[PDB]
Paper text:
Puromycin and the [name]-derived [name] ([name]) enzyme form a commonly used system for selecting stably transfected cultured cells. The crystal structure of [name] has been solved using X-ray crystallography, revealing it to be a member of the GCN5-related N-acetyltransferase (GNAT) family of acetyltransferases. [name] adopts a fold consistent with the GCN5-related N-acetyltransferase (GNAT) family, consisting of a seven-stranded β-sheet interspersed with four α-helices. [name] displays the typical structural hallmarks of this family which includes a cleft in the middle of the sheet between the parallel strands 4 and 5 that facilitates AcCoA binding.
In the absence of cofactor or substrate, [name] was highly unstable and readily precipitated. Addition of either acetyl-CoA (AcCoA) or puromycin to [name] in solution greatly improved its thermal stability, with a 12 °C increase in melting temperature. The addition of AcCoA enabled crystallisation of [name] and the determination of its three-dimensional structure using X-ray crystallography. AcCoA binding is primarily through a “P-loop” formed by a conserved Q–X–X–G–X–G motif in the loop after β-strand 4, which allows the coordination of the pyrophosphate moiety of the CoA by the protein backbone. The poor initial electron density around the adenine moiety of the CoA made its unambiguous placement difficult and the adenine moiety has been modelled in both orientations.
Numbering used by the authors: 6 to 199
The structure:
Amino acid sequence: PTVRLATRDDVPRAVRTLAAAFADYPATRHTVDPDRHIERVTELQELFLTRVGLDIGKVWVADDGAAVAVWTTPESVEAGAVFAEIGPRMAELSGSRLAAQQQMEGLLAPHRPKEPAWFLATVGVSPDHQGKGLGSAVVLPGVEAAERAGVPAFLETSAPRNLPFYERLGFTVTADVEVPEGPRTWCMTRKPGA
Ligand SMILES: CC(=O)SCCNC(=O)CCNC(=O)[C@H](O)C(C)(C)COP(=O)(O)OP(=O)(O)OC[C@H]1O[C@@H](n2cnc3c(N)ncnc32)[C@H](O)[C@@H]1OP(=O)(O)O
């Protein structure tokens, strides 16, 4: 279980891991077109991993990409300009589920920290390596970094099996959001010193 920051050479295994990990995720199933679903989800994960994670955020990997963690920090300053580049393509990839994605964003936006914070954008572990402690190991550096910076760490999850996993890392449910014809979503925050 060797954890370190990611390089461009790691992207291929990382994207395979994220695509496989999010294959049956409730939020992805609600917000991404079912037509060529895995292909669409794979491009979204690649687009976020490279253009957001590696370019302006922070990305960690365990066992050369068997697990991945992507964060946006208070240091992620051209998030906005990056969003004008990749934004329209992400809407195309959402396809028929763009209205559902936009509805869900409106429900979660009020519960997001308006103050500077580290956001866990996405985390995935290869299905065959799940339950072996890799997820905890990849997310821990970002959690320690947020605490060192004196800012909260924040995330959103639509899978209730993840609540214990994040609770062990010091996170607490700050919002329990009901999505119409969609998945129940929990917003979680970890203030420095949890
Ligand atoms: C997008 C966001 O910010 S959150 C969405 C994160 N990713 C996903 O939900 C997609 C699929 N899930 C995964 O890739 C992984 O299972 C992770 C990253 C959530 C957890 O990583 P793991 O290596 O499995 O975790 P680790 O071994 O460190 O800890 C195990 C705990 O993870 C939780 N867990 C997460 N996903 C699962 C799952 N599919 N089935 C069972 N338990 C799971 C459980 O609470 C488990 O402990 P438990 O059996 O005692 O309840």
